[PDB]
Amino acid sequence: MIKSYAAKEAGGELEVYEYDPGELRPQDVEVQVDYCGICHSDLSMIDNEWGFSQYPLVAGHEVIGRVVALGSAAQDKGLQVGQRVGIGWTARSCGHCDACISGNQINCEQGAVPTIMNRGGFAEKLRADWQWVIPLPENIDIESAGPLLCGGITVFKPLLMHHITATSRVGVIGIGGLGHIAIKLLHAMGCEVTAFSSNPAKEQEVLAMGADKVVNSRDPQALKALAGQFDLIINTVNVSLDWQPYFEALTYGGNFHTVGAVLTPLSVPAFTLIAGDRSVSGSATGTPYELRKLMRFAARSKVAPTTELFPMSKINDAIQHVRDGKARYRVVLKADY
Amino acid sequence: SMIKSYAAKEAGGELEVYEYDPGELRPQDVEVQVDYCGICHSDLSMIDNEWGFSQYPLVAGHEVIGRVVALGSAAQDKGLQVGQRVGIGWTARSCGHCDACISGNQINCEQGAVPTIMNRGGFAEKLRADWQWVIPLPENIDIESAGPLLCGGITVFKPLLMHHITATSRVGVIGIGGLGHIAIKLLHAMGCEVTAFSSNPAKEQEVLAMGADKVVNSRDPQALKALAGQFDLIINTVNVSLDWQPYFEALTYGGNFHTVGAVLTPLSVPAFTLIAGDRSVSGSATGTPYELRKLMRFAARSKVAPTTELFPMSKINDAIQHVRDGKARYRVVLKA
Ligand SMILES: NC(=O)c1ccc[n+]([C@@H]2O[C@H](COP(=O)([O-])OP(=O)(O)OC[C@H]3O[C@@H](n4cnc5c(N)ncnc54)[C@H](OP(=O)(O)O)[C@@H]3O)[C@@H](O)[C@H]2O)c1
Ligand SMILES: NC(=O)c1ccc[n+]([C@@H]2O[C@H](COP(=O)([O-])OP(=O)(O)OC[C@H]3O[C@@H](n4cnc5c(N)ncnc54)[C@H](OP(=O)(O)O)[C@@H]3O)[C@@H](O)[C@H]2O)c1
Ligand SMILES: [Zn+2]
Ligand SMILES: [Zn+2]
Ligand SMILES: [Zn+2]
Ligand SMILES: [Zn+2]
């Protein structure tokens, strides 16, 4: 049995909960949790904000841990017992559809299985397919690496999709967990970087992360002044803002890319897309290769999430901390046991 | 419980019946019963040890259409079923877990992708390959001609992907043999402008009918001089060393010369030719499992089928000589 922290109903506090994982599947890897970040998606799933949560629910999906068991078909896949590894939002894919066999496992045509649906990292152990267990660079900071596995890849993927380079002008809306990692990554890439934030208390630290300037995200006149100045704007905000001034802040050929899980549909004038050949995009975390590459880049560039550590035994205080908007900038749980 | 095959016992030798024990089925392996197997010039090169890494006895053949007869213990939840019609190409094995493999670039496996031939190929009644290299086929594909698409087809398809060829591209093909005639057919289906460079005037009318806009003598440098700057891409399939400079000069600015032919004498590439016009010279090795899957679907939907001459597998030594003598029109296929 595995000891975890589970929600028994939508929006509930987490209780100690033990479950039987069954036998190790042939492709499975069992990982002993050392750290696990807390992601806004974890809150969304606990609260069933998206409509597919099943209870008891063991969330957590930003895991740094060590390999403790390898399935029968997972023995010569480059992993060894004791290896420090990461697990992100996704745990399973089929491996043989066109998407998987082309290196696009996140888009598995059978549906890639989220780690949380499989029982997640708010626990002492968890399991994933070996393809989704991410090897780590030797010198990576272990305490802060966890959020890179979801927050990091999620903002890294648009940089890949839209071919961002050092000459790009990139904005980031919402400097929380995902957003602040975005700022650090763009800085390491030499880009022009603008942070859009609703909290003046964050301004000085966000400038120190590498933002060239911080703009009030809730001021339409501030955005009006930036018309046509961005190649890419990444939205990480989960609430519905006035998006039109951000569309107009795009230069010709520019992209507005949302990774924030905005429930109210975006209102996208066809005339805004036509005049300037603009685009609106989304993406879901990333692929195993993109994760491997991100972790290596972050370690070599010394891009590390700004982290607040909590003991895993105080997970309910940690979760309320995030709900209350106090995460500076990502909360990470250290496993007790 | 052996596998009957046609093996070469020495470099350049004729093929003799040869039985071998494949061993236990590896967990990832798929055993395929051969229905057809193309003959590729790479088969001859391996038989003759032209490339210096052949091991004898050598069972060649790597353009296989067949049926799945057995699935290893880790190969049964991988979208394949016993009885399924499948293809196997030049490559049989890769590790699956290095960065190249897990990113969909299995042909570039960092442990070294294992050629089908090196672990016994398709000149046999059966062969085995990792499931990732077993290519599922579209329903309505012509199975008698499909075999060569698994190597000849993907090999000339890959530069079309690497160099982002579209219908407005101007593409030349040097050497209209097995690989080259498939490239002409593929380029025709894509709407490109297409020029064939050929050394054999007896092919000219057939190659025009395949879709070449014109056929130019591949051995006449003065004929290539008139086409200076007229091509975005030139694919070389020729295994011998030609006078390459006029082909480089036939590239427009930003154009690419791309060799899939296994030319032993190194290309002489003037830096000034690359600098003036921002040109490139490239190569590639067959392609990835996904690219193979996509190619088979495209070829079936577009009715791109290799022009094939069938031989019974028992007449394999006759078929090999037919290819050696330059008589293939345009790919020999062995029937099992
Ligand atoms: N697409 C994917 O694959 C993927 C992956 C992971 C997460 N997500 C989703 O991405 C979103 C952000 O995740 P996260 O972990 O970074 O959450 P987070 O730490 O709470 O960051 C959210 C940020 O958005 C801003 N924000 C929150 N409420 C706001 C409001 N009313 N008005 C203006 N700004 C507000 C705030 O930044 P400021 O203080 O700077 O204003 C806040 O820090 C979530 O919806 C998450 O579920 C998507
Ligand atoms: N890179 C890869 O991954 C890969 C994969 C498969 C094969 N290959 C290699 O590609 C090459 C072609 O294979 P293939 O099966 O298409 O061979 P093929 O059927 O023999 O075609 C070769 C063509 O090149 C021309 N040719 C031959 N000798 C010539 C000469 N002295 N001068 C001028 N042209 C000559 C001929 O075309 P014309 O009659 O029109 O002049 C001949 O038909 C081989 O070297 C093969 O090993 C590479
Ligand atoms: Zn997350
Ligand atoms: Zn899949
Ligand atoms: Zn071949
Ligand atoms: Zn590999």
Author numbering:
A (entry chain B): 3 to 339
B (entry chain A): 2 to 337
Study authors write:
Escherichia coli possess strong alcohol dehydrogenases that could contribute to producing alcohols through a designed pathway. These powerful enzymes, including YjgB, YahK, and YqhD, show nicotinamide adenine dinucleotide phosphate (NADP)-dependent activities for a variety of aldehydes. YqhD belongs to the family III metal-dependent polyol dehydrogenases, while YjgB and YahK are classified as members of the cinnamyl alcohol dehydrogenase family. We observed a cleft between the SBD (substrate-binding domain) and NBD (nucleotide-binding domain) that forms the active site with a catalytic Zn2+ ion. It was found that the catalytic Zn2+ ion is coordinated by the tetrahedral combination of Cys41, His63, Glu64, and Cys152, which were well conserved.
The electron density of NADP is clearly shown in the NADP(H) binding site of the EcYjgB-NADP complex structure. We observed that His42, Ser43, Ser46, Gly179, Leu180, Ser199, Ser200, Asn201, Glu208, Ser285, Gly327, and Arg332 constitute the NADP(H) binding site. In addition, conserved Ser199 and Lys204 make it possible to specifically select the 2′ phosphate of NADP(H) as a stabilizing 2′ phosphate of the dinucleotide while using a hydrogen bond and charge-charge interaction. As it is holding the NADP, the SBD moves about 4.0 Å toward the NBD with a root-mean-square deviation (r.m.s.d.) of 1.02 Å when compared to the apo structure. It represents that NADP binding can generate the closed form, as observed in other CAD/SAD family. Meanwhile, each position of the four residues was 0.6 Å farther away from catalytic zinc in the EcYjgB-NADP complex, based on its superimposed structure with the apo form through the NBD region. During the determination of the structure comprising NADP, we found that a polyethylene glycol (PEG) fragment occupied its catalytic cavity, which was quite similar to a hexanaldehyde. Trp52 and Trp91 were shown to hold the ligand through CH-π stacking, which appeared to be a primary contributor for substrate recognition.
